[PDB]
């Protein structure tokens, strides 16, 4: 009965048959479920179900009966089935089939409804008698994302089937059995079924908004009553309403959906019921008022992840993780509590911190570093204060003088090499003389004979005679002899004078081979260099335990850290952490490691691989119950416990050397539990494994290495070929090759080990020390704090937990892209009092999923959150807890829209049994309020209106009732495109390649789409639908400079096996890519700078525009016509697709036939990083200026913008031919001609006249863009980053479209146009219009009035459109 508004969304592809959709949804990624169901339907089991409901009903019984799903999984199936998540996955098959299969399958197809493809041969019969062809085109045997494989087989078989018919069943069975035998491996691909109709797909999982477009007024329903002017209490009173209701869940939804309507209905409470001013004790501790925050098992989610699709994928990943944990007897509640524990999160923060290594002599008994300083005892610094407050009371870029030990620099130097020696002599000494507060040390490098001797020489000379004498030899040697061989002619001269009083123990003189001096000193030195990997082709310098390789300007790097370390000391001083009796260098050495291994501590910080340990001992039980195992000792403690597994090639020296070290390490550490895996031209071998398991008891009784070597040779054994099988499966699961050495401690993998000298006994010790710290100790404390320490029964038992919690903290989203914040699971909201602001839904005891929502009722973002969370709360095995936190800071109206979310937790069915389409229905809509319809769609989606007879930008029920006779409005949108978006990087010095051009292709067409790489995050996007695509760099400069190794389809990575350029989209989340591009031979080149096409493709003239109303669209029709009458040339029109009405959209082919022009619809989705516009008018303006380079195809040389309200009397070519004098775009200035208008000319004021020193204030109603130059100058990137930067201030750009080119005319040239090109009554005189080319209707007479009065021929154009519209309406086929 009530006046209603109904909005529905339909996809750009027809609805796949329901049967196939249920198969796909049902078997998400478990193949066994897939084929086990494929058998069931090939029985003809699902033939007796006539309707979608019946068919859906049948699947529930089947899944439950065959043990496939439990309550939790069944419930998750229903929601995912509602969402229609599997439909794009099925359409991927069809697009692939339509575009690559059909054109590469030459012949005459008759009876070939289904057909196997074997060895590029097609067989239309199960009997497999004859082959129709050698299939043309690329190999189809490529295993791609939507594939499934059944069985292992030398031969590869593919069946393209239309499952719907009965014709399928015999073909399936032919290859199912063939796979069961082992002849070949089976996989199914789809064929668009002609039994089904070409009806479009109805989607859900989006939101609709009804935005009030007049917000200015404030001091069933008619209009919202505006209330004076105590906004401040809205959130607070709104929060109470709910609490009071007692069915609170439903209240919030009912209140939050129609919130603008209930504003004046909240002025009454009656007295606020503010018991909950109590819970700002909650605010005082953790979150600021009016902030929306969601947590999923501790995981802090960003806004983009809060949609139905984003949330379904998170549960799927999360349950897999938790189920892994609860096989150890932990409740979902206990499991989550452990994952988000304080001690756990602390560890992640701890090793987010930068790492230092212990540069000290202490291990080498103070006989390796030869310091040129001592700041506490040098009698140079004697003058200076040895006070801490000297450090703390410092400001500037200068170095504070002090007599204290605080900064150290150790540089390893080769005394054979002149360049190396020069560093010490010139570099190091100046610094000493200069009284710098840094201690300078250096350790010689010993790689050759001469080097060994010269270390001895210098070391000796220091020991007896002193630093000055040693320095003296070095100085003299460098200038005098200029070589790294010891020179006595030079050496003896030094002793002659410098041999005065050599103190301490006396000099022995020449020659040197001291049993102690040569042995201990040189070998101790070698032990220092080896320990910190401070040698080789490129040596490593250590400043405050921070490695800086000896390259480029390392001192510049050192100085940067020197200041950064000083500021680190000062802040500890202001908090009073520091005290007078302290060794200051040890502030840095607190967390420093003794040994530096590039495997444990890779320079790529991200490089980390962890495996699920439980999985390893579950999948390969056959293998791991027969490997030589050294159990960790009977009498050792939980803290000592750790599990190690060594994978090595025992047929190689490196492989068996590595194991000896692991065995040695085990003798020392009684807590470790060791496993040995033989990997293996010999195949397998179970023999070598059997040789060791016999010696298992006697393991680590190997006094010498040959005892291990000999044990491998002796004994006669019978190969356990069952062992061999599980062995090769393990490596395949763990993604590791044959003859490769690896080390696994508590799930963490290091390798491949090329040389066993890289991983020694000392390396295992630090590996355990570091790993222990981070992963094991935080798990142990946390675990015990909860009292779950009963569940740990040994080293292997413990590894399952530690390995799982390490996998929990690895992000889905790379840090720095969507949010800078790390993957830290907080438990910090557990402190909060809950009685009067919280309510829970779902069983906490059973729940695997725990949601914590902190929603502000006054927020528009809250409207969406509530709606989505209610549907996810309906799922079994999910728990939700809600916190309401309003703000007292309300300067403007809080919620200015009505909201509806289209989503169901389980599918709905027709009276006919068909699946119910889901719609957003607003009932009891105010009759007098002007409303705007908006779509709040998931990030990967591109949406436009398809069916509507109303103005969605200007909705009023009273007008529709008075014009149409109906109080009911119905509109349909189309999900036209789904995004392929990615973040590029250059290799190896990873930077965003800007100006790079890309081409998206398909086998049908080699030019689907094209875009250019942006500066910010190497961002790019493509508009596509489900299917198989490829990304080729655009032929030209781009392919000349670069080669793209990969499209990052597997993740940020590189994940092995991703050296691919193929993209496929089979999800409603689109495709997220992280491509990599490496520069071709010796290039520092740039695309942007040099070393009739567009006309032919498009038109002589290319004009683009935008309109946001029926009036503005009516005026746009006139604009196009005026051009046409005024030019005997070819014109193409370009439009911003999503701002136009379907009435306009359905009309243009008719305008195109009449006026003889071509048209193309264009759009681009506003990037996630780029700053949004809440106000639609502002969005529109942004579209005209921010995306000029990326909105139009590369093939377009140039474009012209003409405003909707405009009219043109000129042949528009002239604007093309207008010389731009190397400028990217051309504009027309503001009229000075009107005499008395001055007052309102704001661009002659302080701000605009100071800024525009001499430059004009231009008009955005008309302009030329020399697109080739625009992109070449990379103007867009600059516009975008200046806009983003300026936009932080809300009052920054009054009219951005005009203001951005004007603000950028210093930076980006603007060609100025003759003013013959623009006329506006408001600012130009009437005398001017005789020579006027075009007219804008700039802004109290209305726009319709100005047109008729200002231009006499406006009516002539309007009549032409009017009769044609009627001619079309009266044209019925």
Ligand X SMILES: *[C@@H]1O[C@H](CO)[C@@H](O[C@@H]2O[C@H](CO)[C@@H](O)[C@H](O)[C@H]2NC(C)=O)[C@H](O)[C@H]1NC(C)=O
Ligand Y SMILES: *[C@@H]1O[C@H](CO)[C@@H](O[C@@H]2O[C@H](CO)[C@@H](O[C@@H]3O[C@H](CO)[C@@H](O)[C@H](O[C@H]4O[C@H](CO[C@H]5O[C@H](CO)[C@@H](O)[C@H](O)[C@@H]5O)[C@@H](O)[C@H](O)[C@@H]4O)[C@@H]3O)[C@H](O)[C@H]2NC(C)=O)[C@H](O)[C@H]1NC(C)=O
Q: What residue ranges bind ligand Y (CB under 6 A)?
A: 30, 32-33, 36, 66-68
* Other C-beta atoms lying within 10 Å of the C-beta of residue 849: 24
In the sheet where 546-549 sits, what is the strand order? 438-444, 407-413, 540-543, 546-549
Q: How far is the CB of 565 from ligand X (least distance, A)?
A: 38
Spatial separation of the C-alpha atoms in residues 765 and 956, rounded to whole Å = 75
Would you say 1164 is a known binding-site residue? no
Unique residue bearing structure tokens 């994952």: 339
Please work out, in degrees rounded to the nearest 5, the angle formed at the alpha carbon of residue 740 by the alpha carbons of 736 and 743: 80
Q: How far is the CB of 282 from ligand X (least distance, A)?
A: 5
Minimum CB distance to ligand NAG smaller for 229 or for 581: 581
Minimum CB distance to ligand X smaller for 1064 or for 1099: 1099
Q: How far is the CB of 1182 from Ca ion (least distance, A)?
A: 16
Backbone angles phi, psi at 1328, to 5 degrees: -60, -45
**Spatial CB neighbours of 447, under 8 Å, sequence gap ≥ 6:** 414, 535
Q: What is the dihedral of CA 266, 267, 269, 273, to 10 degrees?
A: 110
Residue 94 contact partner, candidates ligand X, ligand Y, ligand NAG, none, CB within 5 to 8 A by sort of partner: none
Q: How far is the CB of 726 from ligand Y (least distance, A)?
A: 15
Alpha helices in 484-553 (DSSP H): 488-498, 522-531
Binding mask 1206-1245 for ligand X (x = CB under 6 A): -----x----------------------------------
Q: How far is the CB of 29 from ligand Y (least distance, A)?
A: 8
Kindly state whether residue 281 participates in binding ligand X, applying the rule CB under 6 A. Answer: yes
DSSP 696: G
Nearest CA among 912, 848, 945 for reference residue 316? 848
Q: How far is the CB of 298 from ligand Y (least distance, A)?
A: 25
Kindly state whether residue 271 participates in binding ligand X, applying the rule CB under 6 A. Answer: yes
Would you say 1177 is a known binding-site residue? yes
Kindly state whether residue 885 participates in binding ligand X, applying the rule CB under 6 A. Answer: no
Spatial separation of the C-alpha atoms in residues 964 and 958, rounded to whole Å = 10
Would you say 649 is a known binding-site residue? no
* Count of chain residues binding ligand X (CB under 6 A): 10
Would you say 1112 is a known binding-site residue? yes
Residue 459 contact partner, candidates ligand X, ligand Y, Ca ion, none, CB within 5 to 8 A by sort of partner: none
* Count of chain residues binding ligand NAG (CB under 6 A): 4
366 class by beta-carbon count within 10 Å (0-12 exposed, 13-18 middle, 19+ buried): exposed
Structure token pair of residue 671: 């807590």
Q: Which of 127, 567, 581, 835: binder of ligand NAG (CB under 6 A)?
A: 581
Spatial separation of the C-alpha atoms in residues 1210 and 1317, rounded to whole Å = 9
Nearest CA among 436, 430, 433, 424 for reference residue 371? 424
Q: How far is CA 1137 from CA 213, 526, 942, 1010, 1133, in A?
A: 21, 70, 10, 18, 12
Partners of residue 979 on adjacent β-strands: 1023
Kindly state whether residue 582 participates in binding ligand NAG, applying the rule CB under 6 A. Answer: yes
Binding mask 1204-1223 for Ca ion (x = CB under 5 A): -x------------------
Nearest CA among 13, 40, 35 for reference residue 24? 35
Minimum CB distance to ligand Y smaller for 39 or for 1059: 39
Q: How far is the CB of 584 from ligand NAG (least distance, A)?
A: 11
Minimum CB distance to ligand NAG smaller for 581 or for 820: 581
DSSP 355: P
1082: left (phi over 0), alpha (psi -120 to 50) or beta: left
Kindly state whether residue 1297 participates in binding Ca ion, applying the rule CB under 5 A. Answer: no
Would you say 1297 is a known binding-site residue? yes
Residue 653 contact partner, candidates ligand NAG, ligand X, ligand Y, none, CB within 5 to 8 A by sort of partner: none
Minimum CB distance to ligand NAG smaller for 577 or for 1093: 577
| Contacts (CB under 6 A) with ligand NAG, residues 560-579 | 577, 579
Residue 841 contact partner, candidates ligand Y, ligand X, Ca ion, none, CB within 5 to 8 A by sort of partner: none
Q: Which run of H or of E encompasses 945? A: strand 941-947
Would you say 567 is a known binding-site residue? no
Minimum CB distance to ligand X smaller for 243 or for 1310: 243
Spatial separation of the C-alpha atoms in residues 1144 and 1116, rounded to whole Å = 10
Q: How far is the CB of 590 from ligand NAG (least distance, A)?
A: 10
Spatial separation of the C-alpha atoms in residues 724 and 517, rounded to whole Å = 54
Q: Give the number of C-alpha atoms closer than 13 A to the C-alpha of residue 672, restricted to the C-beta side.
A: 23
> Given the rule CB under 6 A, which of 277-285, 761-769, 929-937, 1097-1105 is the region that contacts ligand X?
277-285
Residue 270 contact partner, candidates Ca ion, ligand Y, ligand X, none, CB within 5 to 8 A by sort of partner: ligand X
> Given the rule CB under 5 A, which of 335-343, 639-647, 1123-1131, 1255-1263 is the region that contacts Ca ion?
1255-1263
Kindly state whether residue 1122 participates in binding ligand X, applying the rule CB under 6 A. Answer: no
Q: How far is the CB of 27 from ligand Y (least distance, A)?
A: 8
Would you say 1203 is a known binding-site residue? yes
* Count of chain residues binding Ca ion (CB under 5 A): 4
Residue 33 contact partner, candidates ligand Y, ligand NAG, ligand X, none, CB within 5 to 8 A by sort of partner: ligand Y
Binding mask 812-831 for ligand X (x = CB under 6 A): -------------------x
Q: How far is the CB of 152 from ligand X (least distance, A)?
A: 59
* Other C-beta atoms lying within 10 Å of the C-beta of residue 835: 9
Kindly state whether residue 1203 participates in binding Ca ion, applying the rule CB under 5 A. Answer: yes
Structure token pair of residue 448: 């050759």
The overall longest dimension of the chain from CA atoms, in Å, is 119
Q: Give the number of C-alpha atoms closer than 13 A to the C-alpha of residue 1186, restricted to the C-beta side.
A: 23
* Other C-beta atoms lying within 10 Å of the C-beta of residue 720: 19
Minimum CB distance to ligand X smaller for 106 or for 1210: 1210
Q: How far is the CB of 335 from ligand Y (least distance, A)?
A: 18
Q: How far is the CB of 289 from ligand X (least distance, A)?
A: 15
Residue 182 contact partner, candidates Ca ion, ligand NAG, ligand X, none, CB within 5 to 8 A by sort of partner: none
Q: How far is the CB of 374 from ligand NAG (least distance, A)?
A: 21
Nearest CA among 279, 308, 306, 309 for reference residue 295? 306
Would you say 1184 is a known binding-site residue? yes
Burial letters 64-78, b for 16+ CB under 10 A, else e: eeeebbeebbbbbbb
Would you say 297 is a known binding-site residue? no
Would you say 870 is a known binding-site residue? no
DSSP 758: S
> How are beta strands 1076-1079 and 985-987 bridged, if at all?
parallel
| Contacts (CB under 6 A) with ligand X, residues 770-789 | none
1295 class by beta-carbon count within 10 Å (0-12 exposed, 13-18 middle, 19+ buried): exposed
Binding mask 1260-1279 for Ca ion (x = CB under 5 A): -x------------------
**Spatial CB neighbours of 234, under 8 Å, sequence gap ≥ 6:** 263, 266, 858, 886, 890, 894
Residues followed by a gap in the chain, C→N > 2.5 Å: 219, 680, 1091, 1339
Backbone angles phi, psi at 936, to 5 degrees: -105, 80
3-class state of residue 338 by DSSP: helix
Kindly state whether residue 657 participates in binding Ca ion, applying the rule CB under 5 A. Answer: no
- Indicate the annotated binding residues for Ca(2+): 1203, 1205, 1336-1337
* Binding site per annotation, positions for UDP-alpha-D-glucose: 1108, 1112, 1177, 1181, 1184, 1203, 1297, 1336, 1339, 1343
Q: Interface with ligand X by CB under 6 A: which residues?
A: 270-271, 281-282, 285, 831-833, 1128, 1211
Q: Which stretches of the chain bind ligand NAG, using CB under 6 A?
A: 577, 579, 581-582
Q: Which residues are annotated as a binding site?
A: 1108, 1112, 1177, 1181, 1184, 1203, 1205, 1297, 1336-1337, 1339, 1343
Annotated binding-site ranges for UDP: 1108, 1112, 1339, 1343
Which residues are at the interface with Ca ion (CB under 5 A)?
1203, 1205, 1261, 1336
């Amino acid at each position: 009965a009530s006046p209603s508004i109904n909005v529905a969304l339909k996809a750009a592809f027809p609805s796949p048959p329901y049967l196939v959709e249920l198969l796909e949804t049902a078997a998400s990624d478990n193949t066994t479920i897939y084929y086990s169901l494929l058998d069931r339907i090939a029985k003809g089991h699902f033939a007796e179900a006539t309707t979608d409901k019946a068919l859906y009903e049948k699947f529930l019984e089947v899944l439950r009966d065959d043990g496939h799903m439990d309550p939790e999984a069944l419930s998750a199936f229903k929601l995912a089935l509602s969402l229609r998540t599997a439909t794009p996955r099925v359409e991927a098959h069809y697009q692939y089939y339509t575009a690559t299969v059909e054109p590469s399958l030459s012949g005459t197809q008759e009876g070939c409804d289904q057909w196997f493809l074997i060895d590029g041969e097609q067989y239309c019969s199960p009997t497999l008698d004859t082959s129709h062809g050698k299939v043309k085109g690329e190999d189809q045997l490529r295993t791609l994302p939507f594939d499934r494989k059944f069985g292992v087989g030398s031969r590869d078989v593919i069946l393209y089937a239309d499952i719907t018919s009965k014709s399928f069943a015999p073909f399936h069975e032919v290859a199912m059995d063939l796979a069961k035998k082992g002849k070949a491996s089976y996989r199914v691909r789809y064929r668009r079924s002609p039994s089904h109709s070409r009806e479009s797909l109805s989607v859900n999982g989006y939101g609709v908004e009804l935005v009030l477009k007049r917000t200015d007024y404030i001091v069933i329903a008619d209009i919202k009553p505006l209330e004076k002017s105590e906004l401040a209490a809205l959130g607070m009173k709104a929060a109470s309403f709910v609490m009071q209701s007692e069915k609170p869940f439903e209240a919030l939804l009912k209140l939050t959906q129609d919130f603008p309507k209930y504003s004046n209905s909240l002025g009454s409470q009656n007295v606020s019921a503010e018991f909950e001013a109590e819970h700002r004790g909650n605010r005082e501790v953790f979150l600021p008022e009016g902030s929306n925050v969601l947590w999923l098992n501790g995981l802090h989610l960003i806004d983009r992840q809060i949609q139905p699709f984003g949330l379904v994928d998170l549960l799927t990943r999360e349950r897999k993780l938790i189920k892994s944990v609860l096989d150890l007897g932990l409740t979902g509640q206990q499991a989550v509590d452990l994952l988000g524990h304080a001690e756990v999160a602390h560890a992640k923060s701890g090793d987010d911190e930068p790492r230092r290594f212990d540069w000290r002599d202490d291990i080498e008994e103070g006989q390796v570093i030869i310091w040129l300083n001592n700041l506490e005892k040098d009698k140079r610094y004697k003058s200076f204060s040895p006070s801490i407050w000297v450090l703390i009371h410092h400001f500037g870029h200068g170095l504070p003088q002090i007599r204290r030990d605080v900064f150290n620099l150790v540089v390893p130097v080769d005394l054979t090499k002149a360049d190396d020696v020069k560093i010490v002599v010139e570099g190091l000494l100046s610094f000493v003389k200069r009284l710098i507060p840094v201690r300078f040390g250096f350790v010689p490098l010993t790689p050759t004979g001469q080097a060994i001797d010269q270390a001895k020489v210098v070391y000796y000379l220091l020991e007896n005679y002193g630093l000055a004498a040693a320095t003296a030899y070095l100085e003299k040697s460098y200038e005098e002899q200029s070589t790294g061989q010891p020179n006595e002619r030079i050496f003896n001269e030094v002793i002659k004078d410098k041999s005065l009083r050599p103190d301490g123990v006396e000099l022995s003189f020449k020659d040197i081979f001291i049993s102690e001096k040569h042995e201990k000193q040189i070998h101790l030195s070698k032990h220092w260099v080896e320990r910190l990997r401070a040698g080789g082709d490129v040596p490593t310098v250590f400043f405050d335990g921070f490695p800086i390789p000896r390259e480029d300007n390392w001192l510049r790097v050192m100085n940067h850290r020197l200041m950064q370390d000083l500021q680190a000391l000062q802040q500890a001083g202001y908090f009073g952490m520091l005290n007078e009796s302290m060794w200051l260098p040890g502030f840095f050495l607190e967390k420093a490691l003794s040994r530096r291994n590039t495997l444990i501590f890779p320079e790529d910080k991200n490089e980390l691989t962890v495996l699920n340990v439980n999985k390893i001992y579950i999948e390969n039980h056959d293998l791991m119950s027969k490997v030589p195992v050294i159990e960790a000792s009977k009498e050792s403690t939980r803290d000592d416990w750790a599990a190690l597994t060594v994978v090595a090639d025992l047929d190689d020296i490196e492989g068996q050397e590595l194991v000896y070290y692991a065995l040695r390490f085990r003798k020392s550490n009684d807590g470790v539990r060791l496993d040995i895996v033989h990997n293996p031209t010999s195949r397998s071998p179970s023999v070598l494994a059997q040789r060791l398991k016999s010696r298992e008891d006697k393991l680590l009784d190997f006094t010498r290495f040959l005892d291990l070597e000999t044990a491998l040779e002796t004994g006669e054994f019978e190969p356990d070929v069952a062992y061999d099988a599980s062995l090769a499966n393990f490596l395949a699961s763990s993604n590791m090759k044959a003859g490769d050495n690896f080390v696994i401690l508590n799930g963490r993998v290091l390798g491949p080990i090329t040389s066993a000298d890289d991983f020694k006994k000392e390396d295992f010790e630090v590996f355990l020390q570091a790993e222990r710290r981070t992963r094991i100790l935080p798990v142990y404390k946390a675990l015990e704090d909860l009292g779950l320490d009963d569940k740990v029964s040994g080293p292997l038992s413990a590894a399952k937990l530690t390995s799982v919690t390490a996998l929990s903290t690895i992000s889905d989203l790379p840090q720095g892209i969507f949010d800078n914040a790390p993957t830290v699971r907080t438990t910090l909201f557990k402190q909060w009092n809950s009685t009067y602001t919280s309510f829970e839904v779902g069983d906490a005891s059973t729940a695997t999923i725990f949601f914590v929502a902190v929603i502000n009722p006054a927020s528009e973002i809250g409207q969406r959150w509530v709606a989505v969370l209610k549907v996810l709360s309906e799922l079994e095995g999910v728990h939700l807890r809600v916190f309401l936190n309003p703000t007292v800071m309300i300067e403007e109206l809080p919620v200015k829209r009505f909201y509806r979310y289209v989503l169901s937790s389980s599918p709905s069915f027709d009276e006919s049994g068909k699946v119910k389409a889901l719609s957003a229905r607003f009932t009891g809509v105010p009759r007098e309020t002007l409303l705007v319809v908006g779509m709040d769609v998931p990030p990967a989606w591109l949406v436009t209106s398809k069916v509507a007879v109303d103005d969605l930008d200007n909705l009023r029920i009273k007008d529709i009732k008075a014009k149409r006779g109906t109080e009911h409005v119905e509109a349909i949108y189309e999900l036209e495109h789904i995004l392929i978006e990615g973040h590029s990087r250059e290799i190896p010095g990873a930077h965003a390649p800007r100006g790079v051009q890309l081409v998206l292709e398909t086998e049908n067409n080699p030019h689907f789409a094209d875009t250019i790489i942006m500066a910010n995050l190497g961002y790019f996007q493509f508009k596509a639908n489900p299917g198989v695509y490829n990304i080729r760099l655009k032929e030209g400069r781009s392919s000349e400079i670069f080669t793209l190794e990969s499209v990052g389809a597997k993740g940020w990575g590189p994940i092995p096996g991703d050296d691919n350029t193929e993209v496929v989209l089979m999800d409603f989340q689109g495709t997220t890519l992280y491509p990599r591009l490496r520069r071709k031979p010796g290039m520092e080149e740039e695309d942007v700078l040099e070393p009739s096409v567009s006309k032919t493709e498009h038109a002589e003239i290319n004009i683009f525009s935008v309109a946001s109303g029926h009036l503005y669209e009516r005026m746009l029709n006139i604009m196009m016509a005026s051009v046409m009458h005024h030019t005997n040339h070819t014109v193409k029109f370009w439009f911003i697709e999503q701002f136009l009405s379907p009435s306009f959209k359905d009309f243009i082919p008719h305008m195109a036939a009449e006026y003889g022009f071509k048209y193309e619809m264009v759009t681009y989705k506003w990037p996630h990083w780029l700053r949004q516009q809440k106000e639609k008018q502002r969005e529109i303006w942004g579209y005209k200026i921010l995306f000029l380079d990326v909105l139009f195809p590369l093939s377009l040389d140039k474009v012209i913008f003409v405003d909707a309200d405009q009219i043109v009397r000129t042949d528009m070519y002239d604007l093309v031919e207008h010389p731009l004098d190397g400028a990217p775009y051309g504009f027309a200035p503001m009229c000075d001609s009107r005499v008395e208008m001055e007052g309102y000319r704001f661009w002659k004021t302080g701000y605009w006249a100071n800024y525009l020193k001499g430059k004009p204030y231009h008009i955005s109603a008309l302009y030329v863009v020399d697109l080739q130059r625009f992109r070449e100058l990379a103007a867009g990137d600059r516009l975008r980053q200046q806009y983003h930067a300026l936009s932080a201030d809300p009052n920054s750009l009054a009219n951005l479209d005009q203001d951005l080119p004007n603000h950028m005319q210093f930076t980006i040239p603007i060609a100025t146009l003759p003013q013959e090109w623009l006329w506006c009554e408001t600012w130009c005189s009437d005398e001017t219009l005789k020579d006027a080319r075009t007219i804008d209707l700039c802004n109290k007479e209305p726009k319709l009035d100005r047109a008729r009065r200002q231009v006499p021929e406006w009516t002539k154009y309007d009549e032409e459109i009017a009769e044609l519209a009627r001619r079309v309406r009266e044209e019925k086929p």
